[PDB]
Amino acid sequence: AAQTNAPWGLARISSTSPGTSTYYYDESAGQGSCVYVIDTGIEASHPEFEGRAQMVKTYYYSSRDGNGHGTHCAGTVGSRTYGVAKKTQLFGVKVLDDNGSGQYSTIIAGMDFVASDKNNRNCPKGVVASLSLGGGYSSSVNSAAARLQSSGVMVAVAAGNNNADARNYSPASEPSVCTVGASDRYDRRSSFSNYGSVLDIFGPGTSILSTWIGGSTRSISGTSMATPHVAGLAAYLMTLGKTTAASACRYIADTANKGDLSNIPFGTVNLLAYNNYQA
């Protein structure tokens, strides 16, 4: 399959080198795995989804998504057009306020909730979760990902805007999960990317065009956005039948484009993610 003039992210991961606008991917397309959008949830009534989206839990009053960045990244996970895993089902948790922030009680809550929910949904191919989130180191929030990870849910966590070493930040810091950094179209680590030995991968995170609340669609900037790309990709590949939840984070890392990046400070990884699709 070959969806064209594609968001550079999608195009980049389909391709061993930059300067291409076509997302190639399988027929499967991530059909039948589950992805766990842990953000400000989703506006599933957006056309792009076709009703593969649903708000499964909301630690707030209104399931309906307010901020949008939540929905946005669900779009990059698996909308029809902007999505990596175009055929996947998508499950909004709402752990965040509609002005971005939210309590660590309530993230851990929602990290613990997907460990539950995965039984209550049908995820033969396997569950993924995205945490386009984090803040200061907190051993709990890290355990709240390794606990989630130990369950057989592939967790993909963002590294952060802060241009530090990601070691300071949770749930990025965690050993077991997939920390993700962000490339720009010219294969430079974006300067808003958080780096470190901890990391295992760089997605596309600079200027990603995806869905947006109120039916619209737009382009935003963040490692936040690099996460689904890997998430939707791990959804894509657990579907193709190429890993468990616990082995994906390596197999994504093992089958990546080594030494493709510029702006890689010493210690940090030099991988960019790649769907490896012999078209």
Entry resolution (Å): 3.2
Domain extent at residue 55: 1-279
Q: What CA–CA distance (Å, rounded) separates 246 from 266?
A: 27
In one-letter notation, the amino acid at residue 101 is S
* CATH assignment of the domain containing 54: 3.40.50.200
Could you tell me whether strands 34-39 and 127-131 are parallel, antiparallel, or unpaired per DSSP bridges?
parallel
Q: Which two tokens stand for residue 84?
A: 């990596």
Length, in residues, of the chain: 279
Number of domains making up the chain: 1
Helix (H, G, I), strand (E, B) or coil at 123: coil
As annotated, the binding site for Ca(2+) includes 16, 175, 177, 200, 260
Half-sphere CA count of 254, side-chain side, radius 13 A:
8
Residues 6+ apart with CB under 8 A from 119: none
Q: What CA–CA distance (Å, rounded) separates 170 from 120?
A: 27
User: Residue 2's CB: how many other CB atoms inside 10 A?
Assistant: 11
- Set 69, 72, 173, 193: catalytic member: 69
Residue 279 gets which letter from DSSP?
Answer: -
- Set 46, 132, 224, 229: catalytic member: 224
Residues 6+ apart with CB under 8 A from 173: 137, 142, 166, 167, 179, 198
> Is position 224 annotated as part of the catalytic site?
yes
Could you tell me whether strands 89-94 and 34-39 are parallel, antiparallel, or unpaired per DSSP bridges?
parallel
Q: What CA–CA distance (Å, rounded) separates 14 from 248?
A: 18
Helix (H, G, I), strand (E, B) or coil at 20: coil
> Is position 39 annotated as part of the catalytic site?
yes
- Set 15, 28, 33, 39: catalytic member: 39
As annotated, the binding site includes 16, 175, 177, 200, 260
| Burial class for 215, CB neighbours closer than 10 Å (0-12, 13-18, 19+) | exposed
Experimental method: electron diffraction
Q: What CA–CA distance (Å, rounded) separates 129 from 157?
A: 8
Cβ(240)–Cβ(84) under 8 Å?
no
